[PDB]
Write a protein that holds these residues in place. Structure first.
Motif, PDB file in Angstrom:
ATOM      1  N   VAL A  23       0.836  -1.199   0.000  1.00  0.00           N
ATOM      2  CA  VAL A  23       0.000   0.000   0.000  1.00  0.00           C
ATOM      3  C   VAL A  23       0.871   1.248   0.000  1.00  0.00           C
ATOM      4  O   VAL A  23       0.623   2.198  -0.753  1.00  0.00           O
ATOM      5  CB  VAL A  23      -0.974  -0.024   1.191  1.00  0.00           C
ATOM      6  CG1 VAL A  23      -1.796   1.253   1.229  1.00  0.00           C
ATOM      7  CG2 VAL A  23      -1.879  -1.232   1.095  1.00  0.00           C
ATOM      8  N   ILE A  24       1.903   1.270   0.844  1.00  0.00           N
ATOM      9  CA  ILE A  24       3.007   2.192   0.624  1.00  0.00           C
ATOM     10  C   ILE A  24       3.818   1.695  -0.566  1.00  0.00           C
ATOM     11  O   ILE A  24       3.947   0.486  -0.797  1.00  0.00           O
ATOM     12  CB  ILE A  24       3.876   2.319   1.889  1.00  0.00           C
ATOM     13  CG1 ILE A  24       2.990   2.556   3.111  1.00  0.00           C
ATOM     14  CG2 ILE A  24       4.880   3.447   1.739  1.00  0.00           C
ATOM     15  CD1 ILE A  24       3.141   1.512   4.175  1.00  0.00           C
ATOM     16  N   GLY A  25       4.387   2.626  -1.324  1.00  0.00           N
ATOM     17  CA  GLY A  25       4.900   2.285  -2.637  1.00  0.00           C
ATOM     18  C   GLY A  25       6.118   1.383  -2.641  1.00  0.00           C
ATOM     19  O   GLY A  25       7.168   1.747  -3.176  1.00  0.00           O
ATOM     20  N   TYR A  26       5.984   0.201  -2.048  1.00  0.00           N
ATOM     21  CA  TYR A  26       7.024  -0.816  -2.057  1.00  0.00           C
ATOM     22  C   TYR A  26       6.569  -2.013  -2.880  1.00  0.00           C
ATOM     23  O   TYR A  26       5.392  -2.385  -2.854  1.00  0.00           O
ATOM     24  CB  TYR A  26       7.373  -1.273  -0.641  1.00  0.00           C
ATOM     25  CG  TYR A  26       8.282  -0.330   0.107  1.00  0.00           C
ATOM     26  CD1 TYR A  26       8.649   0.889  -0.440  1.00  0.00           C
ATOM     27  CD2 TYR A  26       8.771  -0.658   1.363  1.00  0.00           C
ATOM     28  CE1 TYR A  26       9.474   1.754   0.237  1.00  0.00           C
ATOM     29  CE2 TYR A  26       9.601   0.204   2.052  1.00  0.00           C
ATOM     30  CZ  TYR A  26       9.947   1.408   1.483  1.00  0.00           C
ATOM     31  OH  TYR A  26      10.774   2.275   2.153  1.00  0.00           O
ATOM     32  N   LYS A  27       7.506  -2.608  -3.610  1.00  0.00           N
ATOM     33  CA  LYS A  27       7.253  -3.827  -4.359  1.00  0.00           C
ATOM     34  C   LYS A  27       8.407  -4.791  -4.136  1.00  0.00           C
ATOM     35  O   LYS A  27       9.510  -4.394  -3.752  1.00  0.00           O
ATOM     36  CB  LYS A  27       7.075  -3.553  -5.857  1.00  0.00           C
ATOM     37  CG  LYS A  27       5.642  -3.294  -6.274  1.00  0.00           C
ATOM     38  CD  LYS A  27       5.561  -2.173  -7.295  1.00  0.00           C
ATOM     39  CE  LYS A  27       4.740  -2.589  -8.503  1.00  0.00           C
ATOM     40  NZ  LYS A  27       3.360  -2.997  -8.127  1.00  0.00           N
ATOM     41  N   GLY A  28       8.138  -6.070  -4.375  1.00  0.00           N
ATOM     42  CA  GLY A  28       9.185  -7.059  -4.282  1.00  0.00           C
ATOM     43  C   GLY A  28       9.623  -7.333  -2.852  1.00  0.00           C
ATOM     44  O   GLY A  28       8.882  -7.143  -1.883  1.00  0.00           O
ATOM     45  N   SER A  29      10.874  -7.785  -2.737  1.00  0.00           N
ATOM     46  CA  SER A  29      11.414  -8.203  -1.450  1.00  0.00           C
ATOM     47  C   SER A  29      11.430  -7.074  -0.429  1.00  0.00           C
ATOM     48  O   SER A  29      11.419  -7.346   0.776  1.00  0.00           O
ATOM     49  CB  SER A  29      12.825  -8.762  -1.636  1.00  0.00           C
ATOM     50  OG  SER A  29      13.714  -7.757  -2.081  1.00  0.00           O
ATOM     51  N   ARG A  30      11.438  -5.818  -0.880  1.00  0.00           N
ATOM     52  CA  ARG A  30      11.383  -4.699   0.053  1.00  0.00           C
ATOM     53  C   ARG A  30      10.113  -4.702   0.888  1.00  0.00           C
ATOM     54  O   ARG A  30      10.109  -4.134   1.985  1.00  0.00           O
ATOM     55  CB  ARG A  30      11.501  -3.372  -0.693  1.00  0.00           C
ATOM     56  CG  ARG A  30      12.508  -2.423  -0.079  1.00  0.00           C
ATOM     57  CD  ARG A  30      12.360  -1.027  -0.648  1.00  0.00           C
ATOM     58  NE  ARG A  30      13.159  -0.839  -1.849  1.00  0.00           N
ATOM     59  CZ  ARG A  30      13.690   0.318  -2.220  1.00  0.00           C
ATOM     60  NH1 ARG A  30      13.521   1.416  -1.503  1.00  0.00           N
ATOM     61  NH2 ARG A  30      14.413   0.372  -3.335  1.00  0.00           N
ATOM     62  N   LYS A  31       9.035  -5.321   0.398  1.00  0.00           N
ATOM     63  CA  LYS A  31       7.822  -5.431   1.199  1.00  0.00           C
ATOM     64  C   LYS A  31       8.050  -6.227   2.476  1.00  0.00           C
ATOM     65  O   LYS A  31       7.316  -6.032   3.451  1.00  0.00           O
ATOM     66  CB  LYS A  31       6.697  -6.071   0.381  1.00  0.00           C
ATOM     67  CG  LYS A  31       6.024  -5.129  -0.602  1.00  0.00           C
ATOM     68  CD  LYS A  31       4.772  -5.740  -1.221  1.00  0.00           C
ATOM     69  CE  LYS A  31       5.021  -7.146  -1.736  1.00  0.00           C
ATOM     70  NZ  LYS A  31       3.885  -7.662  -2.549  1.00  0.00           N
ATOM     71  N   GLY A  32       9.046  -7.112   2.500  1.00  0.00           N
ATOM     72  CA  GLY A  32       9.295  -7.930   3.669  1.00  0.00           C
ATOM     73  C   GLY A  32      10.183  -7.325   4.729  1.00  0.00           C
ATOM     74  O   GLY A  32      10.366  -7.931   5.788  1.00  0.00           O
TER      75      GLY A  32
END
Ligand SMILES: [Mg+2]
Ligand SMILES: [Mg+2]
Ligand SMILES: [Mg+2]
Ligand SMILES: [Mg+2]
Ligand SMILES: [Mg+2]
Ligand SMILES: [Mg+2]
Ligand SMILES: [Mg+2]
Ligand SMILES: [Mg+2]
Ligand SMILES: [Mg+2]
Ligand SMILES: [Mg+2]
Ligand SMILES: [Mg+2]
Ligand SMILES: [Mg+2]
Ligand SMILES: [Mg+2]
Ligand SMILES: [Mg+2]
Ligand SMILES: [Mg+2]
Ligand SMILES: [Mg+2]
Ligand SMILES: [Mg+2]
Ligand SMILES: [Mg+2]
Ligand SMILES: [Mg+2]
Ligand SMILES: [Mg+2]
Ligand SMILES: [Mg+2]
Ligand SMILES: [Mg+2]
Ligand SMILES: [Mg+2]
Ligand SMILES: [Mg+2]
Ligand SMILES: [Mg+2]
Ligand SMILES: [Mg+2]
Ligand SMILES: [Mg+2]
Ligand SMILES: [Mg+2]
Ligand SMILES: [Mg+2]
Ligand SMILES: [Mg+2]
Ligand SMILES: [Mg+2]
Ligand SMILES: [Mg+2]
Ligand SMILES: [Mg+2]
Ligand SMILES: [Mg+2]
Lengths: 88, 114, 68, 100
Positions: free
Chosen positions: B35-44
RNA sequence: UGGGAGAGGGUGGUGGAAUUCCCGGAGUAGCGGUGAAAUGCGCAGAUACCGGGAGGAACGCCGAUGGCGAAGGCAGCCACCUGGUCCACCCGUGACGCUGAGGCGCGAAAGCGUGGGGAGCAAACCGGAUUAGAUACCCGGGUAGUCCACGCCCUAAACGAUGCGCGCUAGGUCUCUGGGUCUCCUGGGGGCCGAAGCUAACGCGUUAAGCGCGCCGCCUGGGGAGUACGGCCGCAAGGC
């Protein structure tokens, strides 16, 4: 299971003298009782192989006892198999 | 509207999802690492979980809620950070409970988990 | 600080004595090992069987949520 | 001719009249399956650790019975058909084992 | 005769945790996945949350260098039927024993036939990445199969790579399970260290791979090869 009453009845039935519990005739009679009951169980529980191994052991033990009795007293051997209906 | 709610934190190894629910478990709002503009492994990452918890709590206050009971499911990297962010966001954290579902030797796991 | 130590004589086969048997459970409703309890191996086997019986009967829990 | 303990858990929100009715049905089953009673306990309404039939409490009964073995599986089955009977557990009586 | 422990076996029931699916509620901009991604899924409203229902499979903690079994193997709980085994009493029989070419029975997984079932997983298969290529490893899907009944198949690193029985040869220590005179002694199992002895060495060592006796099986350089031919077995795969 086999209760003490039927076992004592068999022991009195086949014993030679009143205080006898381990003669060949009594051992054969007790083995025959166990074998008959176990074979009746196995006629229904066909997949019960583990119990069937024990049945094989019992049959072998009774065969050895009967061979000894026949080799030491043919008259006693014939009387015992006639009374028990073993032959076959 | 209600001033008391529940905070569910679902912290997998790939993402942390935070939902605010009414005392009957019906959600009011939610937020995740994406929901905050993170995608991929950064979401973890733990920081993404902190931001997601802060965002969900901010939306909950914007709805007018003041206290939440926290339920944590999963053992991801952003678990403790999200719990602490809820603890210091402006909401009364009465209790925190662990409710991660574990089978009593149930279904066969996937190969990666065997 | 052992569950067996801090108790009197009781039946190990009793599946209705909730108050005594619950002392042999962790905070989440899990059976304690021999380390925490202090019974022997046979006693632990009897305790585990009775605990499972009481779980089935609906007295003791299967699991409880961990509370910080 | 062997001893058993029969544990029954029923509806907790059952009135006195229906409770006595179900008690009489339980006794009728016990006599119909050749069971002799040696002791009875009625602990009543207790709080369950987990819901049973979405109900947080249960009403308990505990009978000491003596019966032939071959009927035990039949009797229990008859005790599970009623919609107000929540749990039926029949166990073989065992001598107490004592710690300390 | 009196007692004991045990996931030993077969049959019938039933407890909760969890996955999946469907119904309803609430709610919105992504979820999932990786080393990093992408395929995929999702505004035709997914993911996360709550309630209800259905179904299948497996039994967390206890639990172990633990236990049972001839081996293969055996784990929720309850009931029934049934096998083995151990101790005490020293009661009965009176050598009735050991081994065993053939025979018979059992025999993990995978596989095969006929019905049933099918949640999860997952050979083959499809797609995405990776790579020089990637018929793989990683990811998203996915059919047999995995489950049940009956009938076949009969193999394995089916291993302790150690055939079975009996007797004799210092101990120490840990543990399961009995009896007692319950400090301790005396049986039966499971491990570790070590006398003497043995061994090419590694190591074994009262659970022998030591010292002996009895009976059975097997070996005679490597490859060709567990192949070919013949024979027997199997529906087939294939086995001996
Ligand atoms: Mg991710
Ligand atoms: Mg869309
Ligand atoms: Mg939805
Ligand atoms: Mg289904
Ligand atoms: Mg076995
Ligand atoms: Mg056996
Ligand atoms: Mg004597
Ligand atoms: Mg004499
Ligand atoms: Mg000999
Ligand atoms: Mg020969
Ligand atoms: Mg097989
Ligand atoms: Mg296997
Ligand atoms: Mg198979
Ligand atoms: Mg098949
Ligand atoms: Mg591929
Ligand atoms: Mg390239
Ligand atoms: Mg795959
Ligand atoms: Mg899949
Ligand atoms: Mg399939
Ligand atoms: Mg083996
Ligand atoms: Mg060998
Ligand atoms: Mg050898
Ligand atoms: Mg041999
Ligand atoms: Mg020993
Ligand atoms: Mg030893
Ligand atoms: Mg050793
Ligand atoms: Mg040694
Ligand atoms: Mg040794
Ligand atoms: Mg040698
Ligand atoms: Mg030569
Ligand atoms: Mg061949
Ligand atoms: Mg040929
Ligand atoms: Mg053929
Ligand atoms: Mg071959």
């Amino acid at each position: 299971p086999i209760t003490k009453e039927e076992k004592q009845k068999v022991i009195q039935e086949f014993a030679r003298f009143p205080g006898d519990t381990g003669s060949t005739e009594v051992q054969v009679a007790l083995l025959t009782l166990r074998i008959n009951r176990l074979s009746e169980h196995l006629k229904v529980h066909k997949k019960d192989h583990h119990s069937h191994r024990g049945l094989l052991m019992m049959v072998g033990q009774r065969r050895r006892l009967l061979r000894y009795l026949q080799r030491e007293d043919p008259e006693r051997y014939r009387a015992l198999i006639e009374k028990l209906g073993i032959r076959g | 509207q209600v001033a008391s709610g529940r905070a569910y934190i679902h912290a997998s190894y790939n993402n942390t999802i935070v939902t605010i629910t009414d005392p009957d478990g019906n959600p009011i709002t939610w937020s995740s690492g994406g929901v905050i503009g993170y995608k991929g492994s950064r979401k973890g990452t733990p920081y993404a979980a902190q931001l997601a918890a802060l965002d969900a709590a901010k939306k909950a206050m914007a709805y007018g809620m003041q206290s939440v009971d926290v339920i944590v499911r999963g053992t991801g990297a952003g678990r403790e950070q999200a719990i602490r962010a809820l603890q210091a966001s402006g909401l009364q954290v009465k209790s925190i409970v662990d409710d991660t579902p574990v089978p009593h030797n149930g279904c066969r796991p996937k190969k990666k988990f065997r | 600080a052992k569950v067996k130590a801090t108790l009197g004589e009781f039946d190990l086969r009793d599946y209705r004595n909730v108050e005594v048997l619950k002392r042999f459970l962790s905070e989440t409703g899990k059976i304690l090992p021999r380390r925490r309890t202090g019974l022997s191996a046979k006693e632990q086997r009897i305790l585990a069987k009775t605990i499972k019986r009481a779980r089935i009967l609906g007295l003791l829990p299967f699991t409880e949520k961990l509370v910080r | 001719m062997r001893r058993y303990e029969v544990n029954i858990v029923l509806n907790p929100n059952l009135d006195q009249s229906q409770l006595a009715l179900e008690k009489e049905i339980i006794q009728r089953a016990l006599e119909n399956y050749g069971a002799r009673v040696e002791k009875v306990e009625e602990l009543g309404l207790r709080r369950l650790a987990y819901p049973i039939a979405k109900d947080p409490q249960g009403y308990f009964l505990w009978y000491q019975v003596e019966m032939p073995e071959d009927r035990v599986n039949d009797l229990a089955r008859e005790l599970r058909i009623r919609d107000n009977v929540r749990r039926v557990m029949v166990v073989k009586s065992q001598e107490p084992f004592l710690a300390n």
